[PDB]
């Protein structure tokens, strides 16, 4: 069951159609989320990074998204880690080019609008003013449809309707201002609440070296999923920049961490999760790290409970 993602893709959907047709009401076997996550985690280790989800994986992930979505509508669930692992990998699969394929799919009416991993992601920073610019350049969409594609995408990505986006995390009880949260990153034993306000009861604070869109962003870790009695008072700790770094890393450093990459004028643009060796080598060796930009910054969210900024390579 846990090693479900190591089967053939023909027998991956057939073992996930048998789960939904054989366990229709939630709660009787909540261990099916171990199978729905391991299909996602085995489709993320072999996906070309930041590319739109193609039509073969989008059918496989839509089958095993209903078994997760039957369990977010409840209140108490056994699967806490496996449920939050589906959210972080869906955040890593919802990049700036991924939403560019969904807003095409809702405009033309094709099968790209039935399912996308952005509907279950923990990206709270998506607003109307950003999604009007994330439309694809090649599909020349008229302005009457791209206003209806953003309105339809923002309706499925609602924050309060049918409790589908949040409130099941243990770290969601910490934050007081729920309107100013940008993104939540649930790593193992640490859950980073990336917000735009200091009123987040956590373990420490990290104010970024530059500004975000309007006000500067704060990264508050919640170590071992436990709030504090109050918000952290005093100065916010600085993000230590890393100037010297090696690109050809033979061992498995970085695997477990996160490598969120935001932009000052355009907002946050790409969150990635470093699950194993094949994802780490596909970050360092490709053209992802581009330091000739002016407003793009790369943050490394360690699972130790600290943040680092990548600012140089040999």
């Amino acid at each position, epitope marked *: 069951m846990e090693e479900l993602g190591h089967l053939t893709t023909e027998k991956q959907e057939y073992a996930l159609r048998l789960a939904t047709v054989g366990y229709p009401k939630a709660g009787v076997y909540s261990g099916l989320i171990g199978g729905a996550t391991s299909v996602l985690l085995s489709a993320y280790n072999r996906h070309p990074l930041f590319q739109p989800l193609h039509t073969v994986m989008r059918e496989t992930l839509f089958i095993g998204s209903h078994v997760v979505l039957r369990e977010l509508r409840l209140n108490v669930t056994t699967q806490g880690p496996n449920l939050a692992l589906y959210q972080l990998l869906s955040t890593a699969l919802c990049s700036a*080019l991924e939403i560019g394929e969904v807003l095409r799919g809702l405009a033309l009416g094709t099968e790209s609008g039935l399912f996308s991993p952005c509907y279950l992601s923990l990206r709270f920073d998506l607003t109307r003013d950003k999604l009007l*610019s994330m439309a694809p350049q090649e599909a020349t969409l008229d302005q009457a449809a791209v206003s209806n594609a953003v309105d339809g995408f923002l309706g499925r990505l609602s924050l309060e309707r049918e409790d589908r986006d949040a409130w099941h995390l243990p770290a969601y009880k910490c934050v007081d201002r729920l309107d100013k949260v940008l993104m939540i990153i649930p790593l193992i034993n640490v859950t980073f609440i990336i917000s735009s306000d200091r009123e987040v009861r956590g373990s420490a604070l990290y104010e970024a070296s530059t*500004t975000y869109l309007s006000s*500067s962003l704060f990264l508050s870790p919640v170590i071992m999923n436990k709030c504090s009695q109050g918000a952290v008072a005093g100065e916010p700790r600085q993000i230590p920049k890393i100037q010297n770094f090696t690109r050809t890393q033979k061992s498995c450093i970085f695997c477990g961490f996160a490598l969120l990459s935001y932009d000052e*004028k*355009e907002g946050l643009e790409t969150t990635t999760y470093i699950t194993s060796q094949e994802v780490q080598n596909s970050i360092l060796s*490709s053209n992802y790290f*581009d330091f000739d930009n*002016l407003h793009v910054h790369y943050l490394l969210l360690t699972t130790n409970g600290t943040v680092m900024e990548i600012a140089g390579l040999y």
Partner: antibody
Framework: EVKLLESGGGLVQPGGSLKLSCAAS????????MTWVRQAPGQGLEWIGE????????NYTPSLKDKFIISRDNAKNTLYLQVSKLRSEDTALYYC?????????????WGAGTAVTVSS | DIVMSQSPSSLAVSAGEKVTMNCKSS????????????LAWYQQKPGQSPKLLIY???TRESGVPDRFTGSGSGTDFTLTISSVQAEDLAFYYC????????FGGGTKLEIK
């Protein structure tokens, strides 16, 4: 409307300083990256620098150390540019251009222009 | 140190013919993780402040007419005016927002 408007041009002696100003209305002068762009007499446009909303980061064109000092004041709804050590080639106009967020770091609204001249 | 080029300098039109102008960069202006192609095309009428026509090399700003269909990606970029008229005699500058911004040379449209 928006109507960015500068003031503080004229004829300046060479080898000094000047504090040009900007003035905005009709929109929120805070939460906006404002820039400065100068022309030349009948030549192509040149970029000078920019400043974020809370005055935390300031970029510049490749130049000397303190040739340009950009500093905004959100209470007066003004934006100041201070050109120091005026050479004989700084005669220009000076545009106060606002750069919005989800644009391609381009300049939406441009001001009028203030003729700076440096000579005898 | 991104330096922009433009050709030709003095492009003369007649009232109605389709014309183009190239803005060939020196370095690639392509954001690798969102595919945005940082660029902006500006028009300066003689005796006015510039105007913003295109940004991100294809997305035309609102209020600009439908005759300014500019595109191109990676290093070379073009701007294609569909049917020019006497209300378009102006310079045309291309900017880049990848590095510290650098305007282009400038092409002007002289009616014959």
């Amino acid at each position: 409307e928006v109507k960015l408007l500068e003031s503080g041009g004229g004829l300046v002696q060479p080898g000094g300083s000047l504090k040009l100003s900007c003035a905005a209305s009709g929109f929120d002068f805070s939460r906006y990256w404002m820039t400065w762009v100068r022309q030349a007499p009948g030549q192509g446009l040149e970029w000078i620098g920019e400043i974020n909303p809370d005055s935390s980061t300031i970029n510049y064109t490749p130049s000397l150390k303190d040739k340009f000092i950009i500093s905004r004041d959100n209470a007066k709804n003004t934006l100041y540019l201070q050109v120091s050590k005026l050479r004989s080639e700084d005669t220009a106009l000076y545009y106060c251009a606002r750069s919005p967020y989800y644009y391609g770091s381009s300049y939406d609204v441009w001001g009028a222009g203030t003729a700076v001249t440096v000579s005898s | 140190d991104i330096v922009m080029s433009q050709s030709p300098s003095s492009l003369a039109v007649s009232a109605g013919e389709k014309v183009t102008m190239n803005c060939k960069s020196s370095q690639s202006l392509l954001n690798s993780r969102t595919r945005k192609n940082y660029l902006a095309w500006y028009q300066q009428k003689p005796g006015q402040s510039p105007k913003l026509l295109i940004y991100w090399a294809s997305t035309r700003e609102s209020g600009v007419p439908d005759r300014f269909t500019g595109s191109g990606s990676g290093t070379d970029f073009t701007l294609t005016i569909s049917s020019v008229q006497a209300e378009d005699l102006a310079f045309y500058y291309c900017k880049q927002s990848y590095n510290l911004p650098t305007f282009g040379g400038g092409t002007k449209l002289e009616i014959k």
